[PDB]
Amino acid sequence: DMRNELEEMQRRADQLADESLESTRRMLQLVEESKDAGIRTLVMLDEQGEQLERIEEGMDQINKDMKEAEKNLTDLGK
Amino acid sequence: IDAICKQRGSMAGSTGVHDTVVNQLLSKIDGVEQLNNILVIGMTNRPDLIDEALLRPGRLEVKMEIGLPDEKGRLQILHIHTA
């Protein structure tokens, strides 16, 4: 009558982490810095676009003025 | 029912899972919290091995013996099966 039976106990392997808290924090800090740099680039790019738009009008005005002056001088000369 | 409700102490299963089940069943059928909407039916061939605390008039009060019939029962059975 040496017929034995058993029961079982369970253990849980550690969840997936303990490497997600050293590279993670550095990743977040770098992401924040990149976000700030992107915001600054946004602002600078908008300012540059405004300045180019401003330049356009003066360019067109000088072109028109020179063309009209040349035509007038030619007309009077002949 | 006699496969999970033998007397408590006998049957020296060294696991200890044959008394915990009986205790849980006893504590669930009639315990501190009261139920009034259940009905339990048990069927066994060896009524002498059931726990004596499970058969008291508060847990399993009605006990019936089903035995061989007589002529007036055999006639009814044959009619039922030949109708």
UniProtKB/Swiss-Prot annotation, chain A:
UniProt keyword annotations, A-Z: Cell membrane, Coiled coil, Cytoplasm, Lipoprotein, Membrane, Palmitate, Phosphoprotein, Repeat, Synapse, Synaptosome
Q: Where is this region: Disordered?
A: 1-18
Query: Where does the record place it?
Result: Cytoplasm, Perinuclear region; Cell membrane; Synapse, Synaptosome; Photoreceptor inner segment
What Gene Ontology biological process does one annotation of this record name? long-term synaptic potentiation
For bias kind Basic and acidic residues, which ranges apply?
1-15
Region Interaction with CENPF: start-end pairs: 1-70
The record's GO molecular-function terms, alphabetically, read: calcium-dependent protein binding; lipid binding; myosin binding; protein domain specific binding; SNAP receptor activity; SNARE binding; syntaxin-1 binding; transmembrane transporter binding
Gene Ontology CC: one annotated term: perinuclear region of cytoplasm
Q: Which domain of life is it from?
A: Eukaryota
Modified how:
Palmitoylated. (Microbial infection) Targeted and hydrolyzed by C.botulinum neurotoxin type A (BoNT/A, botA) which hydrolyzes the 197-Gln-|-Arg-198 bond and inhibits neurotransmitter release.
Keyword Phosphoprotein assigned: yes
* Function description: t-SNARE involved in the molecular regulation of neurotransmitter release. May play an important role in the synaptic function of specific neuronal systems. Associates with proteins involved in vesicle docking and membrane fusion. Regulates plasma membrane recycling through its interaction with CENPF. Modulates the gating characteristics of the delayed rectifier voltage-dependent potassium channel KCNB1 in pancreatic beta cells.
Q: Quaternary structure?
A: Part of the SNARE core complex containing SNAP25, VAMP2 and STX1A;this complex constitutes the basic catalytic machinery of the complex neurotransmitter release apparatus. Recruited to the SNARE complex following binding of the SNARE complex component STX1A to STXBP1. This complex binds CPLX1. Found in a complex containing SYT1, SV2B and syntaxin-1. Found in a ternary complex with STX1A and VAMP8. Interacts with HSC70 and with SYT9, forming a complex with DNAJC5. The interaction with SYT9 is inhibited in presence of calcium. Isoform 1 and isoform 2 interact with BLOC1S6. Interacts with CENPF.
What protein does this entry describe? Synaptosomal-associated protein 25
**Source organism:** Rattus norvegicus (Rat)
Q: Which residues of the full protein are shown?
A: 6 to 83 of 206
UniProtKB/Swiss-Prot annotation, chain B:
- Entire protein: shown range: 330 to 412 of 744
Organism field: Cricetulus griseus (Chinese hamster)
Gene symbol?
A: NSF
- Similarity comment text for this entry: Belongs to the AAA ATPase family.
Q: How does it assemble?
A: Homohexamer. Interacts with GABARAP and GABARAPL2. Interacts with GRIA2. Interacts with PLK2, leading to disrupt the interaction with GRIA2. Interacts with MUSK; may regulate MUSK endocytosis and activity. Interacts with CDK16.
The places in or outside the cell where this protein is found are: Cytoplasm
The entry's function note states: Required for vesicle-mediated transport. Catalyzes the fusion of transport vesicles within the Golgi cisternae. Is also required for transport from the endoplasmic reticulum to the Golgi stack. Seems to function as a fusion protein required for the delivery of cargo proteins to all compartments of the Golgi stack independent of vesicle origin. Interaction with AMPAR subunit GRIA2 leads to influence GRIA2 membrane cycling.
Domain of life the protein comes from: Eukaryota
Protein name (database record): Vesicle-fusing ATPase
